[PDB]
With several copies, the nearest count.
Chain A
Amino acid sequence: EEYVVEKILGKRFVNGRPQVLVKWSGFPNENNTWEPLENVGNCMKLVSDFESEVFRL
């Protein structure tokens, strides 16, 4: 029920709630999906990488 994620690409809020943009492993960008932060606890390493990147600039 969980899929391997390759990269977190973006962050946003929809109706007040935080979401991240997910690039899935073994899938091209056309399959990328905005997921609620609640969904993404098992890839918090990648989330962290993404948040480091935007902080870097």
Chain B
Amino acid sequence: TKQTARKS
């Protein structure tokens, strides 16, 4: 439930 993502 921890909201993460790769950047460009």
Instruction: Please list the residues of chain A having a beta carbon within 8 angstroms of any beta carbon in chain B.
Output: 1-6, 22, 24-25, 33-36, 39-43, 45-46
Contact = CB atoms under 8 A, between A and B. Distances in A.
Tell me if B's interface is mostly helix, strand, loop or mixed. loop
Contacts of B5: 2-3, 5, 22, 35, 39-43
Tell me if A's interface is mostly helix, strand, loop or mixed. strand
Contacts of B2: 4, 42
A45 B7 contact: no
Interface of B: 1-8
B4 A3 contact: yes
29 contacts: A1-B6, A2-B4, A3-B4, A3-B5, A3-B6, A3-B7, A4-B3, A5-B5, A6-B3, A22-B5, A24-B7, A33-B7, A33-B8, A35-B7, A39-B5, A39-B7, A39-B8, A40-B5, A40-B6, A41-B5, A42-B1, A42-B3, A42-B4, A42-B5, A43-B4, A43-B5, A45-B1, A45-B3, A46-B3
